[PDB]
Amino acid sequence: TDRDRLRPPLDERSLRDQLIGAGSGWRQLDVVAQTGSTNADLLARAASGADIDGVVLIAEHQTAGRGRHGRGWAATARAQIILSVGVRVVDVPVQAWGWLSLAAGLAVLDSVAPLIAVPPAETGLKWPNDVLARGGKLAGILAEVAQPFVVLGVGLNVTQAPEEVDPDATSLLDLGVAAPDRNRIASRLLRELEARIIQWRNANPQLAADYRARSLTIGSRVRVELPGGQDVVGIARDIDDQGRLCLDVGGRTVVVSAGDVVHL
Numbered sequence: 001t002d003r004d005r006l007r008p009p010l011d012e013r014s015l016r017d018q019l020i021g022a023g024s025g026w027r028q029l030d031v032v033a034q035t036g037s038t039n040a041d042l043l044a045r046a047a048s049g050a051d052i053d054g055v056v057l058i059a060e061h062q063t064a065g066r067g068r069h070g071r072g073w074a075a076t077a078r079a080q081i082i083l084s085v086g087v088r089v090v091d092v093p094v095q096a097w098g099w100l101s102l103a104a105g106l107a108v109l110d111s112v113a114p115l116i117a118v119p120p121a122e123t124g125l126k127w128p129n130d131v132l133a134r135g136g137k138l139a140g141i142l143a144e145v146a147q148p149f150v151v152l153g154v155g156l157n158v159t160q161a162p163e164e165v166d167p168d169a170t171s172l173l174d175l176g177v178a179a180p181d182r183n184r185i186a187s188r189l190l191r192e193l194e195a196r197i198i199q200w201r202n203a204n205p206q207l208a209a210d211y212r213a214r215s216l217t218i219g220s221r222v223r224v225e226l227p228g229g230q231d232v233v234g235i236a237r238d239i240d241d242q243g244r245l246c247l248d249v250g251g252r253t254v255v256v257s258a259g260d261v262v263h264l
C-alpha cells in the first residue's frame, strides 16, 4: 500500500543508546524482524531461567499475537510499535498487581497524546487495557503473570490501517499524525513506562490520580461483558486498590476484576 513509505524500520542502536545506561532502569533491548508473540517470547525466557526484569523486546512484525482472554492481536510489518517488557513484581503485594496493567495504558497514552494537533472526543483510557482516540482502539495492553515476573505487552497502532487489523481500531496516522516517528515514540513510551512502573512499585497516589484524570470509563454508562458470557449494565464509578472496576447497578455496587467494557 501507500503507507509503506511511511513505515521506515526501527533503529535498534539508537534506542539502546537512549534507553540503556545511567539514569535508566532498562537493562536490555532487542529489536527482532518478526516473532509469533513478544509476550510469549519473554515468558519463555523467564521459563528457562532468565532474569527479565527491565528487559525490552520489540518486534517489527508479529504473526501470532495474543489478546486478552484467548483472543488475538493482528499486525502488519512496521505499522505498529509492538513490544513486551519484564517486570519483577514479587516484592509488591499480589493484590496490587492489577494496577501494573492500568499504569501501562497510562504510559502509552501520555507518550503519544502531544503528537495530535487537536484531541477529538473519546480520547483516553478504557478499563482495563485500552487506549482510545476518537472512539477507536489505538493501543491494547496485555499483562501475563509468571512469578516472580509480570510480562507487559503493548500493541500501539502507529500507521496501521483499521482495514488491516480490526474495524474498531484506529492509528496515529488515522488521527491526523501525518509522519509519525516510531523511534521517537518508542523512546517516549519506554521512558513513561519506567516512571509509571516505579510509581506502581512504591504505591504512589499519583498513579491512580493520573489514571482517573484520563479515564473514559469512570462516570459513563457501561455494558460489561464478563468472562463466561454474562453482561452487566450500570454506571462506572471508580477503580479500587486492586485495579478492579466498581459499577453502580441501580444503587448496588458490583466490582469486576475482568471484562470487556462498552461505553453506552
Ligand SMILES: Nc1ncnc2c1ncn2[C@H]1CC[C@@H](CNS(=O)(=O)NC(=O)CCCC[C@@H]2SC[C@@H]3NC(=O)N[C@@H]32)C1
Binding pocket: 036, 037, 038, 039, 040, 064, 065, 066, 067, 068, 069, 071, 072, 073, 074, 075, 082, 083, 084, 129, 137, 138, 139, 140, 141, 142, 153, 154, 155, 156, 157, 160, 165, 166, 168, 169, 170
Ligand atoms: N492491531 C489492532 N488494533 C486494534 N484492535 C485490534 C488489533 N488487532 C486485533 N484487534 C482486536 C481484535 C481482538 C481484540 C483484542 N482485544 S483485547 O482482548 O482487549 N486484548 C488486547 O487488546 C491486548 C493486546 C495486546 C497485544 C500486544 S502486542 C505485543 C504483545 N505480544 C502479544 O502477543 N500481545 C501483546 C482487539
